[PDB]
Symmetry: D2
Subunit: 347 residues, 4 copies
């Protein structure tokens, strides 16, 4: 099969012809129909995963096949696989744990001490076939097709968990920074579909602000025009928001929006963008605010988002299909910020 | 009656002879038997409450009578008071709310938009009598005497809530910074009495380290000798602690102990000590750690700690009784760090 | 003013001309614009409140003015009232606590040891004016008018809390029994607006089944035609529902629907309909199911539902306005089951 | 190896000489050093597991080797096993799931749709060796020896989870029925070690009542002498208990103790004893009480109890060691109620 792999750090990804794995035990072999590409892949091609080294820190034995956003048809199964048949359309949770550690025993597999992340330190979906270590990490698609589901295994589960960490309910108000972007609109849809909270979205361009409203935001704010903090104080009547979800934060967002927090407000940070949180401790203690990290998600999170998307209660991202061979080009577009919607490869 | 009050910011507290209030409605009049003094009172005499102004920010109309740590005998009751009689020994929750705001409706009275904090922006226990706005904020003492209960209305409820915000359970490990101090040993006792978690205490002097163990710490660390972080990694087998409770933190503690955090670990900050939290955002997101503020506590917290202390399940602080007239002297001792145990005035 | 009151148990309610109360302290005087009537009022006119005696058990000193569903204009305020002015349109939470007991201290006011329930053991809204003990129990209306808000202080807060006790999330499925009735459709709307869960509604007539779907049910079942349990097993693929909310249950519902429960499923019982729960203990233990009671709700619940209704995220019940003088007639209609929608009196 | 197995329902267990399994993949082979026997084994020898049929309902292919309480030395490992070596002393969690179903994905493995329960529908510890499907279900012993740990894999995890379902905290009071028995004292120790709640134990004989106090109960009640309900009302000052944990309940306990429940109280039912819960629905709704089932527990529960026992924070049951050959005799003793403490076989 064809495979686009990270052969040498720095250089561009290399197309190779390698053997097709034979699944044993609980393993499943998927014929890839959709392989999502996100900004994470820019870092990956560099050797890092958010200021790390898939090589030094995550023990990768180059080359590895990228592609952590996976959907496709079951091609073959090991003899321990139960509940799935050749031909089933499935999406795959790539954030897998080994089972024995603390995080795996308490149901936080994605935080496993020895992660098995498909597309990051295990061969991924940038190929005609990919091996799924255990069939339990799959979800049968009935409403969505591969292209629509694949991005959900990453952006879907990520914003789903962030909304959860926002501890929302009908009595609260949520601020989504960058609400007009791909991640942002996903967050808005998920918040509206599951919390009942009042949703405020803020973005910089007009199209974005428009998109956030379409996604279901109760209030939208163009930071280019009005003062975000002033508008939030107006809308919340000076209380502030009970939660902020800052998707792919920056030095900017982190220096601004924490000021919008209401007492007991939670500032949920997502993404690996290199920035530092500077903040006056006494402020944190007086207001009982909280800064909380969030990355990808667990089996429960995956189950939840897939259930929402298959229910139609949440809508597929704007995607742009491309060829397996255009992998580098797709990553370049993200590295240059010229990417249309979510780019998905079709082997 | 005699009252020691904050007449003029900066100057020392002034002894005055003023009228004894007559309780109406749900109000209760207490004859003060114990008036605790804590570092908070140092700031108070300065006009601030953790980088604030009881004058400008908290609307105080000087003079105010200090004393937010209150225990005593019921002297008289308004005609709406139910369930308490003249002569009852009670401790008092000073962190009162008005009832109508968000925080009051959700049971977080202490975070009320228009707080009624006895001893801070309402006359307190530095007097022979003090008025309690509503009888619901009291707890009848049966096992403890005034001197033993008074500190619990502040240090007791404060560490009780911090332990709660640490989200502990038997499968987790907790690090208490400054575990040998007054607050610190309180935290250790409360953690051991209610969480089942493994408790690690760290302090700087040997007596302190000894005190933390007596308080019930499973492990104690003298940071003066060994490397705290190395020892924690050993004890936790490299996982890190699931929670840190940093009582009266500093630039030091905040720059050191967050490194001991395990994934999903919570760093609970308490106290108003002027310092800033500097930390690399990507680290927060990868590890899903959380920085959480905590100040005083609510009716549930007060109820919980009082119930623990009256049960003997938690022990009274080391106290040092003094006279109402030695108020300034008592605050000076704290301002100079020469204070023995918790100083309590006895009008 | 005119007042329709319970003068003598058994007999019909009596119209009287009595004095208008003068609010003192935190009290508020409301000019009633909407006084809802629900089946609860049938029992009330009998002397009971769900197999009780407002007389013997709830200490009523007949006569009492009924009307626990209250909305109206502020006519006057005591001198302690803050944040509301003469003329404001408000809805009122009648399930008030005294403040001092366990339930009041932990934020469950409605379960207070010495309840102050307006319209049940305190004079209610069946009059031109009604006194609200404390202004904190109000919510300013901006979108809804009195008639639309009044029912929410009872059916709204009740189903809101039941949905909460159902512990729903996107990964779960909820069964609402009687989903076509007034309460039922309220439950469906609230579930859809705040949980993200898949919602299954079951009712007996076709109009009802239709109404449940309009309310937003994902699946509806006419028990008159198909087998409820078979259909649920189909829809849930044999798992069963994670929660059932049985509004105004009966011997029937209780003997049928608990069979639809999935493991760890919660059966939420609402209403005072006289029936007994019979069930095989071993079944409960093997499946870890739970039977949970729920009645009215607390300040947080009230806040949540009012916030949803004012947001439009939940819609007003079908109401039928009547005159204060038609009180008995309105209760008769419920006692005979000929009542149109929710009947609201307009003094 | 020797194995005592359920060859034919009804008849007594049969000693056989069968092959020793060879572990592959993540499997581990344990040399059994302790095989606990509990009342569950009485039902097992009958063909049922709490009104079921390991044959018809749980798909057993007789014969099966009993023994769901397992501790021992690692004899051999499959080539996928990580983190354990030949010779390690471990205890084993027998309540295993397959991974793919709802319950497995949300971290409730023990409620798996296709359970793998060692000693019940998979060969167990009544033998010289037993195969553990996956190494993640183990816990390395350092403080406890096999005999002390083995019972914890059942009675330990069971009461640990029940205490959890009791939702206790310092402000609450817990009633443990049968507090003097083996399970009962385990519950008391766990409650005291992890909740901070006031603990009331009730039992029938004096020795038992004495044992409950030793286990750490704050209050004990001999139902043979005093009226349980009267005493509870006294102790709780008429509030009632916030939770009851009824271990191996009966028609008796279920008809009595639910009356001790305080509002919002949880009645936690454990065990498969054949009885029905009869209770007046209106009572449940007015008081918001809850009836909750509980059986065994999950990986988190197992982790928690093992962590408590290895910490010494909870003490080993009173055990009585016997020989693998005395299996039937041991089950007979339980079937006749003449068993000393917890009987453990030593192959
Ligand atoms: Zn991605
Ligand atoms: Zn792991
Ligand atoms: Zn203090
Ligand atoms: Zn307030
Ligand atoms: Zn009503
Ligand atoms: Zn109360
Ligand atoms: Zn057992
Ligand atoms: Zn399963």
């Amino acid at each position: 099969m064809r495979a686009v792999r990270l052969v040498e750090i720095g250089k561009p990804l290399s197309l190779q012809e390698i053997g097709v794995p034979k699944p044993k035990g609980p393993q499943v072999l998927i014929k890839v129909e959709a392989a999502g590409v996100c900004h994470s892949d820019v870092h990956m091609r560099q050797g890092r995963f958010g200021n790390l080294r898939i090589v030094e820190d995550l023990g990768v034995k180059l080359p590895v096949t990228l592609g952590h956003e996976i959907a496709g048809k079951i091609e073959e199964v090991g003899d321990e696989v139960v509940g799935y048949s050749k031909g089933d359309l499935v999406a795959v949770n790539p954030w897998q744990g080994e089972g024995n550690c603390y995080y795996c025993r308490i149901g936080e597999e994605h935080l496993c001490d020895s992660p098995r992340w498909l597309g990051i330190n295990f061969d991924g979906a940038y190929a005609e076939y990919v091996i799924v270590p255990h069939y339990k990490y799959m979800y049968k698609l009935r409403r969505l097709n591969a292209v629509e589901a694949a991005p959900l295994t990453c952006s879907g589960i990520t914003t789903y968990r962030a909304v959860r960490k926002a501890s929302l309910d009908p009595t609260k108000t949520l601020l989504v920074v960058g609400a007009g972007g791909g991640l942002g609109t996903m967050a808005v849809q998920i918040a509206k579909a599951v919390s009942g909270a009042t949703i405020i979205g803020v973005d910089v361009r007009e199209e974005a602000v428009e998109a956030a409203k379409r996604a279901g935001a109760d209030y939208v704010i163009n930071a280019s025009m009005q003062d975000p903090l002033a508008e939030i104080r107006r809308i919340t009547e000076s209380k502030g928001v009970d939660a902020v979800i800052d998707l792919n934060y920056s030095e900017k967002t982190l220096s601004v929006y924490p000021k919008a927090l209401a007492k007991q407000g939670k500032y949920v940070m997502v993404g690996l963008f290199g920035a530092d949180l500077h903040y006056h401790a006494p402020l944190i203690t007086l207001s009982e605010i909280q800064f909380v990290g969030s990355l990808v998600g667990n089996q429960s999170d995956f189950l939840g988002i897939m259930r929402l998307a298959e229910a139609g209660k949440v809508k597929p991202m704007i995607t742009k299909t491309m060829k397996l061979e255009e992998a580098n080009e797709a990553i370049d577009n993200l590295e240059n910020f010229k990417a249309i919607g979510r780019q998905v490869l079709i082997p």
